[PDB]
Scaffold this active site. Structure first.
Site, PDB file in Angstrom:
ATOM      1  N   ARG D  99      -4.983   6.871  10.422  1.00 57.39           N
ATOM      2  CA  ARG D  99      -4.667   5.531   9.461  1.00 57.39           C
ATOM      3  C   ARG D  99      -6.162   5.314   9.132  1.00 57.39           C
ATOM      4  O   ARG D  99      -6.486   5.518   7.747  1.00 57.39           O
ATOM      5  CB  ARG D  99      -4.209   4.286  10.231  1.00 57.39           C
ATOM      6  CG  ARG D  99      -2.491   4.377  10.166  1.00 57.39           C
ATOM      7  CD  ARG D  99      -2.035   3.206  11.010  1.00 57.39           C
ATOM      8  NE  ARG D  99      -0.516   3.300  11.265  1.00 57.39           N
ATOM      9  CZ  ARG D  99      -0.085   2.595  12.250  1.00 57.39           C
ATOM     10  NH1 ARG D  99      -0.736   1.682  12.927  1.00 57.39           N
ATOM     11  NH2 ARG D  99       1.280   2.727  12.269  1.00 57.39           N
ATOM     12  N   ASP D 159       7.856  -7.012  -2.250  1.00 59.51           N
ATOM     13  CA  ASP D 159       8.407  -7.289  -1.120  1.00 59.51           C
ATOM     14  C   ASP D 159       9.604  -8.417  -1.610  1.00 59.51           C
ATOM     15  O   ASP D 159      10.618  -8.634  -1.312  1.00 59.51           O
ATOM     16  CB  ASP D 159       7.549  -7.887  -0.010  1.00 59.51           C
ATOM     17  CG  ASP D 159       6.447  -6.666   0.253  1.00 59.51           C
ATOM     18  OD1 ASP D 159       5.777  -6.677  -0.853  1.00 59.51           O
ATOM     19  OD2 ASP D 159       6.196  -6.501   1.617  1.00 59.51           O
ATOM     20  N   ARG D 162      12.193  -7.594  -3.891  1.00 57.04           N
ATOM     21  CA  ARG D 162      13.466  -6.887  -3.272  1.00 57.04           C
ATOM     22  C   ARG D 162      14.348  -7.825  -2.510  1.00 57.04           C
ATOM     23  O   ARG D 162      15.322  -7.556  -2.265  1.00 57.04           O
ATOM     24  CB  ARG D 162      13.052  -5.748  -2.354  1.00 57.04           C
ATOM     25  CG  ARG D 162      12.484  -4.454  -3.200  1.00 57.04           C
ATOM     26  CD  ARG D 162      11.832  -3.603  -2.055  1.00 57.04           C
ATOM     27  NE  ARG D 162      11.749  -2.249  -2.743  1.00 57.04           N
ATOM     28  CZ  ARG D 162      10.918  -1.365  -2.520  1.00 57.04           C
ATOM     29  NH1 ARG D 162      10.131  -1.627  -1.195  1.00 57.04           N
ATOM     30  NH2 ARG D 162      10.979  -0.111  -3.013  1.00 57.04           N
ATOM     31  N   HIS D 186       1.323  -7.090   3.100  1.00 56.64           N
ATOM     32  CA  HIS D 186       2.383  -6.397   2.189  1.00 56.64           C
ATOM     33  C   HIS D 186       2.985  -5.221   3.238  1.00 56.64           C
ATOM     34  O   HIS D 186       2.126  -4.556   3.872  1.00 56.64           O
ATOM     35  CB  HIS D 186       1.807  -5.656   0.983  1.00 56.64           C
ATOM     36  CG  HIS D 186       2.397  -4.523   0.494  1.00 56.64           C
ATOM     37  ND1 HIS D 186       3.748  -4.758  -0.265  1.00 56.64           N
ATOM     38  CD2 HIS D 186       2.463  -3.278   0.457  1.00 56.64           C
ATOM     39  CE1 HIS D 186       4.223  -3.858  -0.593  1.00 56.64           C
ATOM     40  NE2 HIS D 186       3.507  -2.580  -0.324  1.00 56.64           N
TER      41      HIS D 186
HETATM   42  N1  LIG Z   1       1.570  -2.342  -3.473  1.00 54.77           N
HETATM   43  C1  LIG Z   1       2.937  -2.032  -3.800  1.00 54.77           C
HETATM   44  O1  LIG Z   1       3.808  -2.680  -3.610  1.00 54.77           O
HETATM   45  C2  LIG Z   1       3.125  -0.431  -3.773  1.00 54.77           C
HETATM   46  C3  LIG Z   1       4.482   0.295  -4.057  1.00 54.77           C
HETATM   47  C4  LIG Z   1       4.504   1.559  -4.322  1.00 54.77           C
HETATM   48  C5  LIG Z   1       3.484   2.082  -4.168  1.00 54.77           C
HETATM   49  N2  LIG Z   1       2.185   1.917  -3.938  1.00 54.77           N
HETATM   50  C6  LIG Z   1       1.080   2.697  -3.881  1.00 54.77           C
HETATM   51  O2  LIG Z   1       0.711   3.070  -5.027  1.00 54.77           O
HETATM   52  C7  LIG Z   1      -0.257   4.300  -4.979  1.00 54.77           C
HETATM   53  C8  LIG Z   1       0.037   5.248  -5.666  1.00 54.77           C
HETATM   54  O3  LIG Z   1       1.500   5.922  -5.735  1.00 54.77           O
HETATM   55  P1  LIG Z   1       2.001   7.038  -6.383  1.00 54.77           P
HETATM   56  O4  LIG Z   1       3.329   7.235  -6.028  1.00 54.77           O
HETATM   57  O5  LIG Z   1       1.713   6.994  -7.857  1.00 54.77           O
HETATM   58  O6  LIG Z   1       0.937   8.298  -5.802  1.00 54.77           O
HETATM   59  P2  LIG Z   1       0.583   9.595  -6.767  1.00 54.77           P
HETATM   60  O7  LIG Z   1      -0.066  10.384  -5.678  1.00 54.77           O
HETATM   61  O8  LIG Z   1       1.639  10.362  -7.291  1.00 54.77           O
HETATM   62  O9  LIG Z   1      -0.501   9.124  -7.931  1.00 54.77           O
HETATM   63  C9  LIG Z   1      -1.905   8.823  -7.491  1.00 54.77           C
HETATM   64  C10 LIG Z   1      -2.585   9.346  -8.603  1.00 54.77           C
HETATM   65  O10 LIG Z   1      -4.230   8.961  -8.420  1.00 54.77           O
HETATM   66  C11 LIG Z   1      -4.895   9.933  -8.720  1.00 54.77           C
HETATM   67  N3  LIG Z   1      -6.030   9.878  -8.141  1.00 54.77           N
HETATM   68  C12 LIG Z   1      -6.810  10.345  -7.259  1.00 54.77           C
HETATM   69  N4  LIG Z   1      -8.005   9.962  -7.131  1.00 54.77           N
HETATM   70  C13 LIG Z   1      -8.459   9.657  -8.145  1.00 54.77           C
HETATM   71  C14 LIG Z   1      -9.696   9.284  -8.635  1.00 54.77           C
HETATM   72  N5  LIG Z   1     -10.979   9.357  -7.909  1.00 54.77           N
HETATM   73  N6  LIG Z   1      -9.738   8.540 -10.037  1.00 54.77           N
HETATM   74  C15 LIG Z   1      -8.569   8.514 -10.873  1.00 54.77           C
HETATM   75  N7  LIG Z   1      -7.484   8.844 -10.289  1.00 54.77           N
HETATM   76  C16 LIG Z   1      -7.097   9.479  -8.989  1.00 54.77           C
HETATM   77  C17 LIG Z   1      -4.196  11.085  -8.444  1.00 54.77           C
HETATM   78  O11 LIG Z   1      -4.600  12.119  -9.136  1.00 54.77           O
HETATM   79  C18 LIG Z   1      -2.774  10.815  -8.905  1.00 54.77           C
HETATM   80  O12 LIG Z   1      -2.283  11.109  -9.996  1.00 54.77           O
HETATM   81  C19 LIG Z   1      -0.067   4.633  -3.593  1.00 54.77           C
HETATM   82  O13 LIG Z   1      -1.282   4.373  -2.927  1.00 54.77           O
HETATM   83  C20 LIG Z   1       1.075   4.001  -2.999  1.00 54.77           C
HETATM   84  O14 LIG Z   1       1.195   3.652  -1.802  1.00 54.77           O
HETATM   85  C21 LIG Z   1       2.120   0.588  -3.938  1.00 54.77           C
HETATM   86  O1  LIG Z   2       8.339   1.136  -1.559  1.00 52.80           O
HETATM   87  C1  LIG Z   2       7.432   1.270  -1.043  1.00 52.80           C
HETATM   88  N1  LIG Z   2       7.030   2.559  -0.778  1.00 52.80           N
HETATM   89  C2  LIG Z   2       5.711   3.326  -0.206  1.00 52.80           C
HETATM   90  C3  LIG Z   2       5.571   4.595  -0.566  1.00 52.80           C
HETATM   91  C4  LIG Z   2       5.490   5.630   0.405  1.00 52.80           C
HETATM   92  C5  LIG Z   2       4.929   6.869  -0.275  1.00 52.80           C
HETATM   93  S1  LIG Z   2       4.723   6.557  -1.977  1.00 52.80           S
HETATM   94  C6  LIG Z   2       5.232   4.955  -1.906  1.00 52.80           C
HETATM   95  C7  LIG Z   2       6.096   3.010   1.247  1.00 52.80           C
HETATM   96  C8  LIG Z   2       7.330   3.362   1.807  1.00 52.80           C
HETATM   97  C9  LIG Z   2       7.612   2.928   3.121  1.00 52.80           C
HETATM   98  C10 LIG Z   2       6.381   2.883   4.165  1.00 52.80           C
HETATM   99  C11 LIG Z   2       5.063   2.789   3.517  1.00 52.80           C
HETATM  100  N2  LIG Z   2       4.132   2.710   4.436  1.00 52.80           N
HETATM  101  C12 LIG Z   2       2.663   2.672   4.095  1.00 52.80           C
HETATM  102  C13 LIG Z   2       1.829   1.946   4.805  1.00 52.80           C
HETATM  103  C14 LIG Z   2       0.331   2.176   4.461  1.00 52.80           C
HETATM  104  C15 LIG Z   2      -0.019   2.976   3.564  1.00 52.80           C
HETATM  105  F1  LIG Z   2      -1.432   3.168   3.272  1.00 52.80           F
HETATM  106  C16 LIG Z   2       0.952   3.755   2.721  1.00 52.80           C
HETATM  107  C17 LIG Z   2       2.005   3.695   2.926  1.00 52.80           C
HETATM  108  N3  LIG Z   2       5.000   2.878   2.149  1.00 52.80           N
HETATM  109  C18 LIG Z   2       4.595   2.269  -0.725  1.00 52.80           C
HETATM  110  C19 LIG Z   2       4.873   0.786  -0.572  1.00 52.80           C
HETATM  111  O2  LIG Z   2       4.062  -0.109  -0.217  1.00 52.80           O
HETATM  112  C20 LIG Z   2       6.163   0.405  -0.794  1.00 52.80           C
HETATM  113  S2  LIG Z   2       6.959  -1.222  -0.713  1.00 52.80           S
HETATM  114  C21 LIG Z   2       7.040  -1.634   0.924  1.00 52.80           C
HETATM  115  C22 LIG Z   2       6.932  -0.643   1.945  1.00 52.80           C
HETATM  116  C23 LIG Z   2       7.048  -1.007   3.243  1.00 52.80           C
HETATM  117  C24 LIG Z   2       7.872  -2.101   3.653  1.00 52.80           C
HETATM  118  C25 LIG Z   2       8.385  -2.941   2.536  1.00 52.80           C
HETATM  119  C26 LIG Z   2       8.007  -2.824   1.237  1.00 52.80           C
HETATM  120 CL1  LIG Z   2       8.318  -4.074  -0.056  1.00 52.80          CL
END
Ligand SMILES: NC(=O)c1ccc[n+]([C@@H]2O[C@H](COP(=O)([O-])OP(=O)(O)OC[C@H]3O[C@@H](n4cnc5c(N)ncnc54)[C@H](O)[C@@H]3O)[C@@H](O)[C@H]2O)c1
Ligand SMILES: O=C1N[C@](c2ccsc2)(c2cccc(Nc3ccc(F)cc3)n2)CC(O)=C1Sc1ccccc1Cl
Ligand SMILES: NC(=O)c1ccc[n+]([C@@H]2O[C@H](COP(=O)([O-])OP(=O)(O)OC[C@H]3O[C@@H](n4cnc5c(N)ncnc54)[C@H](O)[C@@H]3O)[C@@H](O)[C@H]2O)c1
Ligand SMILES: NC(=O)c1ccc[n+]([C@@H]2O[C@H](COP(=O)([O-])OP(=O)(O)OC[C@H]3O[C@@H](n4cnc5c(N)ncnc54)[C@H](O)[C@@H]3O)[C@@H](O)[C@H]2O)c1
Ligand SMILES: NC(=O)c1ccc[n+]([C@@H]2O[C@H](COP(=O)([O-])OP(=O)(O)OC[C@H]3O[C@@H](n4cnc5c(N)ncnc54)[C@H](O)[C@@H]3O)[C@@H](O)[C@H]2O)c1
Ligand SMILES: O=C1N[C@](c2ccsc2)(c2cccc(Nc3ccc(F)cc3)n2)CC(O)=C1Sc1ccccc1Cl
Ligand SMILES: O=C1N[C@](c2ccsc2)(c2cccc(Nc3ccc(F)cc3)n2)CC(O)=C1Sc1ccccc1Cl
Ligand SMILES: O=C1N[C@](c2ccsc2)(c2cccc(Nc3ccc(F)cc3)n2)CC(O)=C1Sc1ccccc1Cl
Lengths: 331, 327, 331, 325
Positions: D99, D159, D162, D186
């Site tokens: 982590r 969150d 959903r 989150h």
């Molecule tokens: N906060 C939320 O509710 C939520 C929900 C879903 C996903 N996420 C997060 O969003 C992030 C991205 O998700 P994803 O599925 O699109 O991942 P992804 O790996 O498919 O896309 C990430 C992109 O970031 C780019 N990247 C890496 N280093 C970089 C840099 N130095 N400068 C510019 N770009 C760079 C990668 O090349 C890639 O295209 C993850 O960290 C994921 O956990 C957050």
């Molecule tokens: O819908 C998702 N999917 C993700 C995901 C995973 C791979 S690509 C996107 C997800 C899904 C399930 C777990 C999880 N855990 C996680 C914890 C710390 C990190 F730094 C990265 C990922 N993340 C990233 C994300 O934050 C979400 S919302 C979400 C996640 C867990 C519980 C409740 C909600 Cl509402």
């Protein structure tokens, strides 16, 4: 403390200014239809209303404010004082005199000139970098009057011009062909109203020229009388006024469409009134409608439409007439 | 051959019965504001307008038609004859008349006696949305004349009252009305009920934080927020002569839920018999779930004894007028 | 009593048929981009998704459902079984086989034909009165394949055709002129893709013909090489695939635009693939793109574009090639 | 004369600075879904895309540009260099990678991104999506040197969305009419605020006192549990989440770009609230406008809810204090 302080913790106090403000001057049927259409299209973050009738102005403001829950425009203001209009990106002028029975057309033009002598310096004072959009009639003369009083460059003084004429034309063309007006292309240019010019050469559906397919198009020889489509544009304007007393909805919708291109810097082409001196042999300071590219700087460019000798002469005649009235105006 | 035939080859001239049609009855300031708001929200594929004043009606139709280029509603029709309203999904009634009070109501009843059977004839499966005042009485009148099930007869009710309340609440808190939740229920207009218990921002009850909320002994006078809803209505009429924009916008919002079957909750007038000790055939505003069948469900709001008594008093007043009506 | 029963009083529980349902078959990058664009434009009251990959299908459905709060489409469903598609007004086919040749002894055509053999009867079973919109490639052949299998009248079988080709053309035209694509009119017709035809004669801004101003427009003699604008439409398609592996956003947006005209009965003119037998000397049962009027009955009418001898010959060549493949297909 | 010059007469060549520019950093599934949603809602007059993968970035830019005819965003640009992001009102960060290792790898990514964003758009609002979102909003705030109002975390916005979807399915009501707030950290450790769960201002907790407890016969606690399970399910089924996050981010972007002052559950600096004394970001209902988070709603939390946020704050600070900047 208050319920507000009990409920909400404040991070910053910084009072901010709007980023996309629009002002509408004159809250008549035209002004209010422009206002509702602009509000329903999410074009502004702030809307200001100005008029001389204080009761109607406040009432109109309140009615719009009461609809806030269903809108995405967080601030609606109004006032007699132009301080409410400060830093507007676009200022729409729909203010005008009522023709007073037995009043000459020249006297009515001069009464609108006197109204503009008060409005335009006030607008310029609070929004020096705004785009002016003139709706008030005779629109071509009043766009000139606004340009003269403001001292603005020609790009920032836009007349509604033949925008409604073209919208009515495309509606009628669409009814004849059983096609949506959006897919029926045709341009009505020159002087707004009675003396407007239908450009038969540009009338098309999917790039297929109607004039090439039907050479009699726009002539008296035409068995299908397509010339009546332009005649009905003029007749429909008189008919609407005869039936309901004024026009509001179509003009309001057409103005909001212009507002969209300006506010969003779309660079779409619209038939609007601009300074035509130097085109079609015109030497006078007159405004006529041609297709203009509308964006964040107003009219940045214009389309040079190739007109026939007859079309060129009609615009030249309109220029001579407008200048004849304009030279006699007291500023 | 005509220019149209030379330009366009026709595959079929078959015209379908209206699919998402809306009718507006009455082309006054209210009806036309409903019309423009419905047109600008793309809720219908066909809009029909009806009135008794033939000139104003045709003029209003033409003005809207001239704006077609900027709209996504391909057919706008009008007429005195109700054949223009055939196959409407939703029919909006905005037609209206020191008067005897029961007289004002009876004049509109007499108007409804002509309108409602004509609407039912051309659109038997439509949803009726009543705007005309007194809205709670005329929704009852429409339900009685039509013979429609209660789910298909909707009254504008306290939708406007709540929209004004949320606007005023938003101004006091410096928050957008959308994020300011509060319900004004019961009888539309002067006798409406502000439900202080449900007034909240982000699920945080204002009444729980401020127990004096809604009482005369409130130092912040939050009761004035509801008082200003009623005062604003009189003020708008005094200043411009009528209300149009706010009612228009509120009606288009109801129309959106019905036409799109959203199942969103709105404060609208429905048949309340069986609720809050009411035994009479009266229509009052409660939060209703709106969809393609009109009001499919209603929210059972817990009202205080004072709130329940105010709805009961409104029910008695409205029934007192209704029982005296000639149909 | 349950919390639901304590909170909500039910007036009736009458199950009603969806009034504006859309189905998307194939949840690949193309299908999902069509889906998000349709959802963000509020075109449907119900969206159904179908695919053979059950995991991806369920995941895609859930992701869209999780965005419900920000949408105005109250019901999103998915399934391998076509019962989820019942009573759809419009069915969009974006399903296609894996491009990796070694997976089957059959070609891409043969593979996509066998897929349609299973899809089309299932779609017809649950939505007999729907309009079919074909996106899957080769789009002109598969629109014919869909029309043949379905037994639908020609008006209800629409091919995406040259809609994307013309959208890319107008984008490039707009970049060259410094005008929004909406105001840049130009039609790319015939066979979708590599063999498409740019109609130089109809290329215009504000009804002003570019070919009339610049007679060399579209020829090899052209010093400004406007012929390259069409060449770049074809090159850009290969470039997007080379750079990101597929196209999604542009096709999805173009499909949602067609869906808008159909769902709202707009009667707007679009360059789409239709049964062209009886035009440009074509006598075979082939589908090619021409400007079509789109509404609630699908293609009710088509525009008869006047083509040059060279333009006519290119469509004729495409028709001969398409028919040559089609005549060999077993149903 | 050229065809352009024969067709068009030019009045002026003055090209102003973009007035409503948005930048998206990272063109993965999340960034591109944010992009399409922002484009379809007409929130920007200019959209800029940034990534380290040059081919995917150009391809994504071109695909969006090819859809221009159907959009109202006249300029779409992209580049590895942050000069393409100059004068952005809002910058959305969706870029990302033990982590504390994974956190540090994302911190190192931010060490490059954030100074570059600040250089070309010093007055922008930062919207952080990248995970762990609460830690990475803190990292962005620390590196940028921006005031707390201009550093917004996506936080519990998804969150909550959903939760309202699932609440709506249980009640047979549209999510819009189903009010309920999921706050704090989150993801897995989020807090459902049962006291605020309502339909038409009718408190579900007042009607059903067992709401949210283990004692609840109807097990309403499962609605929150399903929010977390659904996230794992979507990732198991399709490999990532895109559409829901993209739509939720465009909704935040709308309030900021249009200065709506609507209340959203987003991550903000909560030091001073709920007995938290550390520099940590957690989700609470925030008022969003042109200056970002101008205000926050003071939600009444129970002792159990307060303790859950305190525990999350301790965990977040525990990781943060060990980070190398
Ligand atoms: N906060 C939320 O509710 C939520 C929900 C879903 C996903 N996420 C997060 O969003 C992030 C991205 O998700 P994803 O599925 O699109 O991942 P992804 O790996 O498919 O896309 C990430 C992109 O970031 C780019 N990247 C890496 N280093 C970089 C840099 N130095 N400068 C510019 N770009 C760079 C990668 O090349 C890639 O295209 C993850 O960290 C994921 O956990 C957050
Ligand atoms: O819908 C998702 N999917 C993700 C995901 C995973 C791979 S690509 C996107 C997800 C899904 C399930 C777990 C999880 N855990 C996680 C914890 C710390 C990190 F730094 C990265 C990922 N993340 C990233 C994300 O934050 C979400 S919302 C979400 C996640 C867990 C519980 C409740 C909600 Cl509402
Ligand atoms: N260009 C077009 O295509 C087009 C189409 C229709 C109408 N019009 C024109 O629009 C104008 C207005 O139309 P209307 O129907 O709304 O008229 P209106 O008389 O109902 O409204 C005009 C408003 O201007 C106000 N006004 C007068 N003097 C003012 C001042 N000094 N400052 C501020 N406000 C002032 C009036 O009080 C009034 O409210 C007319 O000139 C009309 O001819 C133009
Ligand atoms: N429920 C609400 O929240 C709310 C809010 C504002 C106004 N209103 C009501 O809406 C109604 C209309 O308001 P308005 O300002 O537009 O009034 P208006 O008098 O200007 O318009 C009413 C129209 O109804 C027409 N009409 C009369 N008899 C008719 C008939 N037999 N058939 C068809 N049309 C007929 C009139 O000709 C007129 O055009 C009023 O009753 C008013 O009180 C309700
Ligand atoms: N007409 C145009 O302008 C245009 C533009 C771009 C792409 N395309 C075409 O769209 C098609 C799809 O593109 P893509 O990138 O999404 O491909 P993709 O392979 O990623 O997606 C195709 C989907 O179809 C599914 N499928 C296969 N067989 C099926 C069946 N029997 N029933 C239901 N679903 C089935 C697959 O499982 C897959 O999910 C291709 O044929 C492509 O060439 C057309
Ligand atoms: O739709 C309208 N109605 C008006 C009107 C009139 C009263 S309230 C609205 C109209 C209609 C018909 C004539 C006319 N003449 C006029 C001449 C000089 C003036 F200063 C003012 C008005 N004006 C104002 C106006 O300009 C229009 S467009 C229009 C007018 C005439 C011919 C063609 C068109 Cl496309
Ligand atoms: O905003 C309005 N304006 C009207 C109006 C519109 C045109 S003329 C009068 C209004 C305003 C004020 C009083 C009033 N009383 C009334 C009583 C019985 C009737 F049959 C008709 C009207 N009506 C009609 C109306 O219903 C409203 S809403 C309203 C009214 C009073 C208090 C609170 C609200 Cl939220
Ligand atoms: O943008 C695209 N990309 C595709 C593609 C490719 C893999 S995934 C998507 C493309 C791009 C280039 C060539 C090509 N050829 C092809 C031929 C037969 C088939 F059955 C499938 C694909 N296809 C599919 C497609 O039709 C397009 S539009 C297109 C293609 C070529 C020229 C002009 C245009 Cl406007």
């Amino acid at each position: 403390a208050t319920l507000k302080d009990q409920l909400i913790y404040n991070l910053l106090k910084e009072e901010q200014t709007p980023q996309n403000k629009i002002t509408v001057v004159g809250v008549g049927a035209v002004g209010m239809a422009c206002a509702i259409s602009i509000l329903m299209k999410d074009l502004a973050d702030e809307l200001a209303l100005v008029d001389v009738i204080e009761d109607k102005l406040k009432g109109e403001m309140m009615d719009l404010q009461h609809g806030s829950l269903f809108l995405r425009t967080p601030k609606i203001v109004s006032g007699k004082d132009y301080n409410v209009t400060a830093n507007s990106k676009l200022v729409i002028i729909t203010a005008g005199a009522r023709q007073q029975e037995g009043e000459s057309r020249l006297n009515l033009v001069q009464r609108n000139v006197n109204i503009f002598k008060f409005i335009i310096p006030n607008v310029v004072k609070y929004s020096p970098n705004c785009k002016l959009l003139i709706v008030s009639n005779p629109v071509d003369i009043l766009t000139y009057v606004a340009w003269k009083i403001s001292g603005f460059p020609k790009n920032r003084v836009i007349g509604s011009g033949c925008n409604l004429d073209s919208a009515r034309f495309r509606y009628l063309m669409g009814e004849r062909l059983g096609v949506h007006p959006l897919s029926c292309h045709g341009w009505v240019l020159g002087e707004h109203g009675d003396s407007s010019v239908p450009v038969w050469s540009g009338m098309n559906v999917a790039g297929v020229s109607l004039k090439t397919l039907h050479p009699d198009l726009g002539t008296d020889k035409d068995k299908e009388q397509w010339k009546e489509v332009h005649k009905q544009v003029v007749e429909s304007a008189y008919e609407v006024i005869k039936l309901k007393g004024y026009t509001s909805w179509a003009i309001g919708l057409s103005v909001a469409d212009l507002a969209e291109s300006i506010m969003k810097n779309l660079r779409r082409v619209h038939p609007v009134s601009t300074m035509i001196k130097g085109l079609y042999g015109i030497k006078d300071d007159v405004f006529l409608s041609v297709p203009c590219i509308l964006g964040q700087n107003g009219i940045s460019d214009l389309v040079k439409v190739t007109l026939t000798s007859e079309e060129e002469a009609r615009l030249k005649k309109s220029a001579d007439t407008l200048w004849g009235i304009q030279k006699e105006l007291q500023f």
